Write a protein that binds this ligand. Structure first.
Ligand SMILES: *Cc1c(COP(=O)(O)O)cnc(C)c1O
Ligand SMILES: *Cc1c(COP(=O)(O)O)cnc(C)c1O
Ligand SMILES: O=C(CO)N[C@@H]1CCCc2ccccc21
Ligand SMILES: O=C(CO)N[C@@H]1CCCc2ccccc21
Ligand SMILES: [Cl-]
Ligand SMILES: [Cl-]
Lengths: 360, 363
């Protein structure tokens, strides 16, 4: 039995913080807003949600969130249009995804629309924090952690669902990135949990990302299997725009076979391209073997990653088997990329009205 | 750099918890002692270590420990012998394993002998919490977590090291004596080669909860984790698995899976190999074990004992494995269980100070 948005408790800050300075560098995830949502669950079901000042968490030292990684998160954006109106991009898919993560970790179920409403209310209260400068947004970070005060590994009897907000500018995306493609690093496995947005999938990538910087790359290209499938880039889904082995122009991204996180932007790019009907759009396994041949034969136009933070990130170099592979993404416009960026921007900032946007 | 035991600050508690009484059996991991260790790290390095009252943590909402699972833990035991002297079992090895975990997650390094001293100092303060009844001990849980107040996925600039203590009795109900049943379904993967299954990291355990529930639903108490096309037996629950049998070459052997990435290198595991190796009475090997081999060893009556090892259980017999829909009887209890009993007996004598040994670290 879910918490309800009707029952919200508002508690406004006693001393508001000073928003970032216009033009000053908004660093991603370092700056937070005045308020936060917090909801507690226990053996008396969910409690009343509350909007409250950005305050620390008080956890029992045995909290299962900290011992056995009973934690999952989401990530989505609110955009402030010209008319100072704020909109969430396809938040329903994030609520869908968060509930699936919750179940995977035996965490408590909740009503998707109730949480979206509390999020709406939370953003409303802090709507001024939502910046309006070009390419800026409010990053929204929901989290659900276990909070069992016992060392047993078991279905928790207690949990906390909370939400924080960051004004953001950018994360790197007009400029492309280099990838490290080393098969020894494995992000996720079939029958694993790489397809859920659980905190435990990210911690182990930190050292890997360091090795990429050490080898002069900016991101990890997570390979999988003996045929070296391209699964994902850092925390982004991967797309390739190429002329395929059968001479047909297509946009491919790996299918959702377990080792791919089902990105909201990924789906949106699939959706958007289908609607155009101008080229083939497919979900198919992509191997290094295939990418090398394609590059040698000049059939590759663009490689890019997708995700909420970067939206669409061009790729121009992959360090594979100790040798750099050039990727002509930037030579080729990048047309598909710039076109995707434009329409997403038009939609997100309200230029074109669209069912994907949810107004705050 | 590191924190130093010489710099320990002590804040004794002003509100002692009521210790557990008689007719109140110990539930594993639910009862905590009066004090905790706590050490913070940041840009200025490791702060000063302190033993303080058992209290809640105060965490920034963006704490990387909660969003990207920058968390690891340990688990070891303190045993009070008949003379009332308290000893830790091979703690050095837990410190070795904790530092390896920390490096894998880019968390701050520390001096093992310094943490161990702090842990000793901690247990000394809460010495009266250590039970002395047969099969009771004090379970010690160190933890290291990232504590960056930033949603970026990166090497943290702040961490928190803490240690809490639990007086414990048995882990399973009538545990180590009464055997357990296992669900062995190859749909479930605990870890993969090139993953982090060989580190004691929080992230490895949360996904298993649902699987544990599936074993209950199917009438089993534990999960036998299989890996690979040839269904290798990796671990059981949170224990390393061992098989004592007459292998296909007709030689009597104790086998356990090798440390090739999907196996958590348990201290009890390592100890059982050391003990058996030392004895020199049968062949002791680290080798992959597959279901095909087990099925064949069973139908040819070559298996004597199957069991799990780990700090909580110690040595745990298995009597049944449900392989998809085939219910396999494991004759562990009909074979004594002779090796299990021997291991338990020698571990008991070492742990409770019946027989002085270099494996025990006096508190
Ligand atoms: C969050 C995430 C993505 C992209 O998700 P969006 O919903 O598009 O922002 C891709 N891959 C991984 C591994 C992720 O964690
Ligand atoms: C802790 C643990 C073990 C056993 O470790 P010991 O050091 O023997 O207590 C075995 N397997 C897993 C998965 C573990 O987490
Ligand atoms: O939204 C995206 C994709 O561009 N990345 C975000 C950026 C913050 C760090 C992080 C960590 C885990 C999962 C997503 C993310
Ligand atoms: O000591 C052992 C093995 O017998 N298991 C412990 C028991 C507490 C629960 C847990 C959770 C994760 C890793 C180890 C453990
Ligand atoms: Cl999926
Ligand atoms: Cl190892």
């Amino acid at each position: 039995s879910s918490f309800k948005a009707a029952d919200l408790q508002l508690e406004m800050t006693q001393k508001p913080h000073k928003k970032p300075g216009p033009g000053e560098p908004l660093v991603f995830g370092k700056t937070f807003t005045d308020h936060m949502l917090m909801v507690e669950w226990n053996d008396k079901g969910w409690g009343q949600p509350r909007i409250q000042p950005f305050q620390n968490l008080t956890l029992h030292p045995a909290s299962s969130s900290l011992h056995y990684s009973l934690q999952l998160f989401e990530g989505m954006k609110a955009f402030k249009g010209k008319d100072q109106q704020v909109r969430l991009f396809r938040p329903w898919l994030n609520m869908d995804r968060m509930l699936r993560s919750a179940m995977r970790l035996c965490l408590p179920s909740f009503d998707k629309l109730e949480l979206l409403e509390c999020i709406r209310r939370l953003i409303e209260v802090d709507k001024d924090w939502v910046p309006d400068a070009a390419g800026t947004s409010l990053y929204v970070r929901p989290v659900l952690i276990g909070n069992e005060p016992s060392l047993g590994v078991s279905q928790p009897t207690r949990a906390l669902l909370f939400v924080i907000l960051c004004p953001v500018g950018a994360y790197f995306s007009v400029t492309p990135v280099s990838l490290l493609a080393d098969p020894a690093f494995i992000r996720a496995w079939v029958g694993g949990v790489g397809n859920y947005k659980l905190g435990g999938n990210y911690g182990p990538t930190v050292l890997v990302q360091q090795e990429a910087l050490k080898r002069g790359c900016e991101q990890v290209l997570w390979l999988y299997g003996p045929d070296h499938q391209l699964t994902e880039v850092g925390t982004m889904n991967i797309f390739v725009y190429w002329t395929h082995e059968d001479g047909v122009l297509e946009l491919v991204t790996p299918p959702l076979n377990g080792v791919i996180l089902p990105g909201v932007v990924r789906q949106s790019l699939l959706d958007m391209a289908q609607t155009w009907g101008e080229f083939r759009v497919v979900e198919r396994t992509i191997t290094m073997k295939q990418l090398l041949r394609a590059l040698e034969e000049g059939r590759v136009r663009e490689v890019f990653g997708s995700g909420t933070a970067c939206q669409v990130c061009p790729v121009h170099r992959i360090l594979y088997k100790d040798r750099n592979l050039h990727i002509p993404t930037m030579e080729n416009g990048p047309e598909l990329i710039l076109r995707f960026q434009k329409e997403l921007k038009e939609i997100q900032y309200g230029i074109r009205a669209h069912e994907w946007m949810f107004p705050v």
